[PDB]
C-alpha cells in the first residue's frame, strides 16, 4: 500500500513491477534532463543585452533538433517494448481465479476444482479494528499462493470497473461481456492492496482489493474451508 | 489437471472466446455421447476447461437458455 | 454604429461604478452557479 | 413560364435601406415576426420545462 | 455533352431500373414467417419506446415482427 | 506600447473599492453555500 | 469596397437557427422522458422557417442582388466540399460500428454473423433495385448538368425531374422495405447497425431530394445561367455523396453482412 | 441598433468579442467547479456526498473548461478577431453562418447546466462511457441533455471549421501564398481541419449512445451483441485530435508573442513551424488507443500505439527549440504577455514529457486512471492552453479594446497564477505514482499531505482569477487610450489602429509579385 | 433547344461589374496580384487607391515567408522599410 508523503511507486512485489521501476528510473532521468535543459536554455536566452535580430538560417540546427530526439525516443522505446512483450510471454499458470466487478464490490471465483466463490466488500470506517486502514480493508480477502504463476480473469456484471494492485504492476479493466486475462506472481507473502480504477457510480471510491499471499498449503486449507 | 493450459488459438488478453469455445465443445460432445448412448466421460477435458475459465453467471445464463430453447450457439 | 474605445462592446463603460456592478453580476453569476447547483442537488 | 428575374433584381436593389430579409415587402415582416415569436416563446417554454424537470 | 448523358440515361440507366423492377416484381410475395423463439439478443427492451404502448417498434408489421412475448 | 494618461483616473482608494467588490462578488455567494452545507 | 467579397446584411436567422436547435434537443428530451412532443414540434417548425428564410436570402443576394462574384462562388465551392467531408466522417462512425460488431460477433449473437434468429433481406431483390435507382439518378443528374451548361431549359427540367422521381422511388422502396423487414431496430446490434446506418442515409436522400426540388423550382423561375448555377452544382455534389454512401451500405451491410 | 449589432452580427470582430465574453463567463463556471473538486479532496472524508455529486462536478468541470472556455476563446474569439486582420480580409467567408456558430453555444451551455439540475446529474466523466452512462446506471434525462449539449457544441465547431478553412484558403491577397501567412493563421487552419474530421465521429458515437438509451439499440450493450469498448474507440478517435485542437491555436499565439516581445520581425524556422503543426495534426489521428492500454487489446496493437504516440515528440520538439531560437539574440521586453509565453514553453514541455511517460503501455498499466494522468493533462491545459490564452489576452486586449492594462497588476496576476497552478498540480505526480485513482471523492489516509497541498494551490489560483476580473475592470475604468504600437511592419492586425474600425480592408492591401 | 439566360443577359450588381471590367482587361475589385516594376525612385510600383492611403505588403524577396506591411500615403514615393523598394500612390 501507499505510505504517507510517498513520492514514487509502491515497492515492487512482482518481477514485472521491479522491471517497471527500473524502466521508470531510466525514463524519469530523461524527463529531468530535457526539462532542465529547456529551463537552462530559456534562462540563457533571457540573460544578455547582446542582440542579433536579423534573419537566422534554420536548416543545420533543425538536423540536431530532430535526430537527437529521435535517438532519445528509440532509447525509451527499446526497454519499453522489451517489458511489454515480457508481460505477454507464455508462463503456464498453476491456478485460475476470476474476479467480477459489481456496484460496489468485487466477487471472486476459484473454480479449477470446487465451486468456491464469495463477495469482497470494503470494511466501513465505523467497523475498522484498531490498526486497520480506512477505505482499504475488505471483509473477505483474495487469498492466493505466493511464488506461483496465477491467471486472473476479470469481468463485470454491470458497469465498467478496473481491477488494480499497484505493487504487483496490475490493472485490468472489468467489462461486461468480456473476459480479460492478466498474470499475477508474488515474490513475497503479505497483504497487497488496490482500488477500483474505472468510474462506476456512487461508491467508486469504496470497492477496494486486498490480496493475501501465503504458502500453497495454507491456500489449499483456506480454499477447503471456504466451500 | 491444475488449470486450463495456454491455448495458442486464444493467446491474447481477451479470453471470452476460450470460455465460449470450451462450453460449446463440452455440450456438443455430451450431446454426441448421450445420443449414441456412449460415455460423457470422454467430454471431461472440455468440462474442466470451461469450468476453470468461465464466470459462474455466464455458465448459469447459458444453461438456462439451453433449457429454455433460446441458446444461440449451435450444439 | 459607434466606433472607437468603449463603443465596440455590448456593455457600457461610460460610468466605472455602473460597469463594476455589471461585471460583478456577470462574473459573479458564472462563479455562483455551480455552488447553487450543488445546493439544489443536496436539497433533493 | 416567363423570365421575371429582371423585375426581382429591380425590387431587391431598390435604394430603401431595408436588410435583405425584409426587402420583399410586408410578407417578410410577418414571416420574421412569426419565426421570432415561436423561437422566443418556445425558448421561454423550454425554460419552464427545465424548472419543472429540475424537481421530483 | 448533354446528348451523350441523355443517351446513357434512356439507353442504359432506365433500362437497368426497368429490369431490376421486373426482377423485384417476380421475387415479391410474402415469404412464410419463422417459428417465434424468445432469443434474449432480439426484441430488446431496456426502456419503453416513446410512442404507442411502449412495446411496438416504429414500423411494426404484425405479420413478421413478433413482440418479446411472440406474434400478436 | 505608448498610451495617453487615463481619461478617468482610478485612484488607489477607487482601486481598493473595485478589488474589494470584485473579491466579495466571488466569495460571499460560494461562502453562503459552503457555510450552509450541513443544513442542506 | 474595392474587394470582390460579400458583406452580409445583419441577419436574425443565425439566432433563430440556434434557438431551433435548443427547441429540437430539449424537445427530443421532453419526448423521450416526459411523454410530450410539443417542444419538439415547435423546434422542427422554427428550424424549417429558419432554413426557408436563410436560403431565400442567399437567392436574393445572388440571383437578385449580384453579390456572388467568382471569389464568393469559389468560397461556396470550398464550403460545400468541406461540409460533404464532415458528412463522410459522420457515416464513417456508423460503418466502424458495423464492422466492429460483424467481424467479431459475440457469444450473445451465437458467435456468428448474421446473428442467430436474424433473416437478412435478399440483396438481389429490392436492395439491388435501390442500387439501380440511385446509380440511374447519378446519370440523369449529369444529363441535367450538361443540359444547363449547353443552355437547354427543357432538357435540364426533364433530366432534373427524372432525377427527383428516382430519389422519390428510392425513398418509397426503402419505406416499404422498412415495413416488410422481419427484423427491427431492437433486434440487437444487427437491427441497430442496419436501421441507424440506412436510416441516416434515408434522411440524407430526403434532404438531397428536397435540394434538387429547390433547384427544379429555381430553374422553372430562370434563376440559373448557363455559367452560374452553384446551387445546382452543390445539390449534384450532395446527390453523388448520397449515391456513394448507398454503394458502401449495399456492399457492407446488405451483401457482405448477409 | 443594439439587437442588430449584437444578436444579428455579420462582423468578425463583434462575433470575436461575443466569444471572448462567453468564454470568460464559462471560465468562471469552470473555476467554481475546480474549487468544489479541491474542497472535496482538501481533507480526508466526505464534504459534499458520495461519488455521484462529486463526479457530476468533475464531469461538468471538464466539459465547461474544454467546450465553453478554451475552444470559444482560442477559435471563436482570437480566431475571429485576428485571422481576417492577419490576411487583410474584409470579414470571414460566411459571416452570417459565423454568427450561428456563436449563438449555438449559449443553448449548448444551457443543456449542460440542465443535465446537472435534473435527476442526479451526469456523473459519467467527460468521456461518458457506457454502461455507467446507459439508461440503467444513469436512468433519466441527465445523460441525454449532456449528449445534446455536445451535439450543439459539435455543430457550432464544424460550421466554424468550414468558415475558417474557406476564409484562410480563399480570402488572402492574391500575391500571398499559404507560405506567407502568419503562424497563428496556420494554427487555426490546421485546428479547423482536425475539428472537421474528428467531431463527426464523436457525433456518430454519442448518437449511438442516445439510441442505446432511448430506441433500444445495442451498439454498446453485450446483451444485443454490442461492445462498450466500441464507444471508447469512437470517443477517443475524436478525443486525441481534440487535445491537439485545444493546444494548436495556443502554439500559434505563443509563436506571435515570443516573436513580438523578442523584438524580431519573424519566428525562427517558419517552414519548420508549419511542418511541425501539420505533423502533429496528422499524427494526432493515429494514436487514440493510448487512452485504452488497460481495456485488453492485443500486445502488437499496444506496441504500435506506444511507438506512434512517442513520434509526436519530434515535431513538438522542433517548435519548442524554434521558440528558444526566436528568443536568442532578442531585445527582450519583459511584458506580462512575454511572462505567460515563457511559462508556457517550460510548463508545456514538462506536461509533454509526462505524456511521453504515459505513451509507454507497460508503464501506463500502473499510471492509467491515476492522478499521474491528471498531472500530465493539467500541465498542458491549465499551464499550457491557459497560459497561451492569458498571454494572447494581455497582448491583444489593447487592440480589441483601444485601452491598456496596468502592466504591474498583470505581472502580479501572472506571479500568483504561476504559484497556484504549480502548487495544485506538481504534487499530483506523487499521488499518481503512489496509486491514487481518478474520479474519487475520498482517498486512503496515506494520500492526505499531497491532496492538502494541491487543494491549497487551487485557492491561490482562485485569488488569481478574482484579481484578473479586477484588472479588466481597472482598464475599462481608467480609459488609457493606445497611441503607438511597435513592429506593425510584421504584425498587420495592429495597422488599422486600436480598436480597428468596424469595417477594415474595405480597400484591400496591395501586394505585388 | 434554348431558354437558359446567359451571364451577359442576367448577371447584375457586383458580379456584373467584375464581368464587364474583366472583358476590358481592368481589375477595379483587386482580383489579380499586381506585377512589380523595378521599384526604383524613377520607376516606382504604382499603387491605385480610392482614398489617400492604402496598406502595402512587400514580399521583399521571392519566397520570403515574412511580409512587410506599411501605410502608403498620397505624395512622394515611399520605400519598403526592409528592402527599400519604391511605391507611389495613384488615388
Ligand atoms: C512554485 C512551487 C510551489 C509548491 C510546489 C509543490 C512542491 C512539493 C514538494 C516536494 C518535496 C518532497 C519531499 O518531501 O522531499 C523529501 C525527499 C526525501 O528523499 P528520498 O526519500 O530519498 O526520496 C528519493 C526518492 O525515493 C526518489 O525515488 P522515487 O521513486 O521515490 O522518485 C520519484 C519522484 C522523484 O522526483 C522528485 O524528487 C521531484 C523533484 C522536483 C524538483 C522541484 O517523483 C517523480 O517522478 C516526480 C515526477 C516529476 C515530473 C517531471 C518534473 C520535471 C522537473 C523540472 C526540472 C527543473 C529543475 C531545476 O527529498 C527529495 O528528494 C526532495 C524532493
Ligand atoms: C447558460 C447560459 C449561458 C450564459 C452565457 C453568458 C455569456 C453570453 C455572451 C454574450 C454576452 C451578451 C451580449 C449580447 C446580448 C446581451 C443582451 C443585453 O441586454 O445585454 C446588456 C448588457 C450590457 O448592459 P449595458 O451596459 O446596460 O448595455 C449597453 C448597451 O449599449 C445599451 O443598449 P440598449 O440601451 O439598446 O439596450 C440594452 C439592454 C437590453 O437590450 C436589448 O434590447 C436586448 C434584449 C434581448 C437580449 C437577449 C440576449 C440575452 C443574452 C444571451 C446570452 C446568455 O440591456 C440592459 O441594460 C438590460 C439587459 C439585461 C439582460 C442581461 C443578459 C446578459 C448576459 C447574462 C449572463 C449569464 C446569466 C445566466 C444565469 C445563471 C443562473 C444559473 O450586456 C451584457 O450583459 C454584456 C456582458 C456584461 C459586461 C461584462 C464585461 C466583462 C469584460 C470581460 C472582457 C472580455 C472582452 C475582451 C475584449 C473587449 C473589447 C472588445
Ligand atoms: C492540450 C492538451 C493535451 C496535449 C497537447 C497532450 C499531449 C500529449 N499527451 Fe495527453 N492527455 C490530455 C491532454 C493533452 N495531452 C488529456 C486531457 C488526457 C486525459 C484524457 C482523459 O482520460 O480524460 C491526456 C491523456 C494522455 C494519455 C493517456 C494516459 C492514460 O489515460 O493512461 C497519453 C498516453 O500516451 C497521453 C500522451 C500525450 C503525449 C505523448 C503528448 C504529446 O503531444 C506531448 C509532446 C510534447 C513533448 C514531448 C514536449 C516538448 C518536446 C521536446 C522538448 C523535445 C524532446 C523530447 C523528447 C525526446 C521526449 N496523454
Ligand atoms: C482546459 C481544461 C482544463 C483546465 C483549465 C482545468 C483546470 C483545473 N482543474 Fe481540471 N480537469 C480537466 C480539464 C481542465 N481542468 C479535465 C478534462 C478533467 C478530467 C475530467 C474527468 O475525469 O472526466 C479534469 C479533472 C480535474 C481533477 C481530477 C478530478 C478527479 O479525478 O476526481 C482535478 C483535481 O484537482 C482538477 C482540478 C483543476 C483545477 C484546480 C484547475 C485550476 O487550474 C483552474 C484555475 C482557473 C483557471 C485556469 C482560469 C480559467 C479561466 C480563464 C482562462 C478565463 C479567462 C478570461 C478571459 C481571457 C477574459 N481538474
Ligand atoms: C426511409 C428512411 C427515413 C427515416 C425516417 C424515420 C424516422 C424519423 C427520422 C429518422 C432519422 C434517422 C436516424 C435516426 C435514428 C433512428 C431511425 C432509424 C431509421 C428508422 O426509421 O428505423 C425504424 C425505427 O425508427 C425509430 O425507432 C424512429 C425513431 C424516431 C426518433 C428519432 C431520434 C432522433 C435521433 C437524434 C438525431 C441526432 C442527430 C445528430 C446530429 C449531429 C450533429 C453533430 C425501423 O423500424 P422498426 O419498426 O424498428 O423496424 C422495421 C420493422 N418492420
Ligand atoms: C425532413 C428533413 C429535415 C432536416 C432539414 C434539412 C431539410 C431540407 C434541406 C434541403 C437543403 C436545401 C438547400 C437550398 C439552398 C438554396 C440556396 C442556394 O442554392 O443558393 C445558391 C448558393 O449556394 C449555397 O448557398 C449552398 C448552400 C448549401 C446548403 C446545403 C445543405 C445540405 C443541408 C443539410 C442540413 C442538415 C443535414 C444534417 C443531417 C444529420 C445561390 O447561388 P446560385 O445557385 O449560383 O444562384 C445565383 C445565380 O442565379 C446567378 O446567376
Ligand atoms: C438533435 C438535433 C441537433 C441538430 C442541431 C441543429 C443545428 C442547427 C440548426 C440548423 C439551422 C440551419 C439553418 C440554415 C443554415 C444555412 C447555412 C449556409 O448555407 O451557409 C452558407 C455557408 O456554408 C456553406 O456554404 C456550406 C455549409 C452549409 C451547412 C448547412 C447547415 C448544416 C446544419 C447541421 C450540420 C451538422 C453536420 C452533420 C455532420 C456531422 C452561406 O453562408 P452565409 O454566411 O449565410 O452567407 C454568405 C453569403 O455570401 C451568401 O450569399
Ligand atoms: C536552442 C536555442 C539556441 C538557439 C540557436 C540558434 C542559432 C541560430 C544561428 C543562425 O543565425 C546565424 O548567425 C550568424 C552570426 O552569428 C550569421 O552569420 C548567420 O547568417 C545566421 O544564420
Ligand atoms: C408560441 C410560444 C410557444 C408556445 C408554448 C406552448 C406551451 C403550452 C403547451 C401545453 O402543455 C402541455 O400540457 C399537457 C398537459 O395538459 C402535456 O400533455 C402530456 O402530459 C400529460 C400530463 O398529464 C399526459 O397526459 C401526457 O404525457 C401528455 O398528454 C404536454 O406535455 C404539454 O406540452
Ligand atoms: C471556494 C470559494 C469560497 C472561498 C471561501 C469564501 C470566503 C468566505 C466569505 C464569507 O462568506 C460568508 O461567510 C459568513 C461567515 O463568516 C457567512 O455568514 C454566516 O455566518 C455568520 C457568523 O456565524 C452569520 O452571522 C450569518 O448569518 C451567516 O450566514 C455568510 O453567509 C457567507 O456569505
Ligand atoms: C404555436 C403554439 C400554440 C400551440 C401550442 C402547442 C399545443 C400542443 C399541445 C398538444 O399536446 C400533445 O398532446 C398529445 C396528447 O395528449 C401528446 O401525445 C402523447 O400522448 C398520446 C396519447 O394520448 C400518445 O399517443 C403519444 O405517444 C404522446 O406523445 C403530445 O405529446 C403532446 O404534444
Ligand atoms: C410546358 C413547360 C414549359 C416550362 C417553361 O419553359 O416555362 C414544361 C417544360 C419541361 C416540363 C416538365 C418536364 O417535361 C418533366 C415532367 C414531365 C411530366 O410529364 C409532367 C411534369 C414535368 C415536371 C414537366 C412540367 C412542365 O410541363 C414543364 C416544366
Ligand atoms: Cu467499481 Cu469504480
Ligand atoms: Na473527500
Ligand atoms: Zn520590401
Author numbering:
A (entry chain B): 1 to 227
B (entry chain H): 11 to 85
C (entry chain L): 3 to 46
D (entry chain J): 1 to 56
E (entry chain G): 12 to 83
F (entry chain M): 1 to 40
G (entry chain C): 4 to 261
H (entry chain A): 1 to 513
Give verbatim lines from the article:
pmcCytochrome c oxidase (CcO), a terminal enzyme of the respiratory chain, catalyzes oxygen (O2) reduction coupled with the proton pump, generating a proton-motive force across the membrane. Mammalian CcO consists of three mitochondrial DNA–coded core subunits (subunits I, II, and III) and at least 10 nuclear DNA–coded peripheral subunits. The electrons from cytochrome c are transferred through CuA in subunit II and heme a in subunit I to the O2 reduction site, which consists of heme a3 and CuB. Cytochrome c oxidase (CcO) catalyzes oxygen (O2) reduction at the heme a3–CuB site in the transmembrane region of the enzyme. It has been proposed that the hydrophobic channel that connects the transmembrane surface of subunit III through subunit I to the heme a3–CuB site is the O2 transfer pathway.
To identify CO2- and N2O-binding sites, we treated dimeric CcO crystals with CO2 or N2O in both the fully reduced and the aerobic fully oxidized states. CO2, N2O, and Xe2 were all bound to a common site (site 2) near the branching point of another hydrophobic channel that branched from the O2 channel. The electron density of CO2 or N2O at site 2 was remarkably strong and little changed in the aerobic and anaerobic conditions. These results indicated that the affinity for CO2 and N2O at site 2 was higher than that of O2, N2, and water molecules. The hydrophobic interactions that sandwiched the ligand between Phe67I and Phe68I may affect the stability of ligands at site 2. In addition to the hydrophobic interactions, hydrogen bonds between CO2 or N2O and the hydroxyl group of Ser108I, and between CO2 or N2O and Wat2 may stabilize the binding of CO2 and N2O. A previous study showed that incubation of the fully oxidized “fast” CcO under a CO2 atmosphere caused a 3 nm shift in the Soret spectral peak and slowed the CN− binding rate. Therefore, CO2, H2CO3, and/or HCO3− are probably bound close to the O2 reduction site. Third, when CO2 is bound to site 2, this channel is blocked, which may inhibit the O2 supply.
